[PDB]
Amino acid sequence: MILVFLGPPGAGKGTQAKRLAKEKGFVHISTGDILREAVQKGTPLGKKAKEYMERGELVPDDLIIALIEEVFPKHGNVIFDGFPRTVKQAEALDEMLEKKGLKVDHVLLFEVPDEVVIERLSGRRINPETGEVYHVKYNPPPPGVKVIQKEDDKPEVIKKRLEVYREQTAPLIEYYKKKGILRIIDASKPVEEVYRQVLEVIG
Ligand SMILES: Nc1ncnc2c1ncn2[C@@H]1O[C@H](COP(=O)(O)OP(=O)(O)O)[C@@H](O)[C@H]1O
Ligand SMILES: Nc1ncnc2c1ncn2[C@@H]1O[C@H](COP(=O)(O)OP(=O)(O)O)[C@@H](O)[C@H]1O
Numbered sequence: 001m002i003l004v005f006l007g008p009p010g011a012g013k014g015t016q017a018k019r020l021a022k023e024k025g026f027v028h029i030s031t032g033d034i035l036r037e038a039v040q041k042g043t044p045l046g047k048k049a050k051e052y053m054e055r056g057e058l059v060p061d062d063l064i065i066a067l068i069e070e071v072f073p074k075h076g077n078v079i080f081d082g083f084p085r086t087v088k089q090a091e092a093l094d095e096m097l098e099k100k101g102l103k104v105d106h107v108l109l110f111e112v113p114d115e116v117v118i119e120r121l122s123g124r125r126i127n128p129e130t131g132e133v134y135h136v137k138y139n140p141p142p143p144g145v146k147v148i149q150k151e152d153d154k155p156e157v158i159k160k161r162l163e164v165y166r167e168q169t170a171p172l173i174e175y176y177k178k179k180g181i182l183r184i185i186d187a188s189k190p191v192e193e194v195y196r197q198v199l200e201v202i203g
Pocket of ligand 1: 085
């Protein structure tokens with residue numbers, strides 16, 4: 001099974017992807033996590049992607065498409081989490097899969113209002129070492145666990161990221177709807193409730 005998680009930043013896509021991958025045996029492909037590792041290591045990809053990420057812009061398509069070609073699991077179930085982010089990327093994904101006799105089985109759209117998005121992101125805190133994600137209100141980190149607020153989770157960059165999502169990424173909703181594989185998730189609900197719906201639509 002191949003899944004794509006789609007939705008505004010802060011919808012809880014990474015949270016649900018980690019849970020589902022761990023519990024039901026999927027390989028989790030997070031372009032965000034992979035890019036952040038590239039940046040930390042200072043690879044050619046990391047050094048180029050960094051400035052786009054910092055401004056809240058998308059990293060150029062060719063770089064992301066090559067990344068996916070490099071890391072795509074040959075066998076097994078896969079959750080694509082944060083990819084594709086543009087129509088060009090979605091078309092590239094379809095081509096790659098078609099050549100391998102595969103396809104995207106379900107696209108899950110994590111619906112959540114803008115006001116909730118902003119609250120999700122402004123309260124997001126991460127363990128900079130482990131990448132573990134917390135929220136100051138809805139899932140506070142234990143004391144004596146070092147966390148930070150990511151620079152791209154500050155108000156100005158959040159605004160930019162939502163604009164970029166609406167302009168470049170939201171068209172994928174219609175792209176996948178017309179393939180007949182789109183499923184709607186109410187991602188505004190608490191974590192366990194969202195996870196139950198995730199399990200429902202793929203069962
Ligand atoms: N598929 C992609 N195409 C272009 N840029 C990406 C992609 N995935 C991640 N990025 C870059 O990494 C940043 C953070 O990505 P991600 O971790 O998926 O988002 P979020 O902050 O919503 O959890 C994005 O704002 C973008 O700059
Ligand atoms: N259902 C939920 N209710 C409240 N907070 C959530 C929920 N899901 C995730 N979060 C928190 O919201 C923020 C965004 O979650 P994340 O998984 O990083 O979103 P995305 O990957 O879609 O950008 C994180 O701080 C996370 O702890």
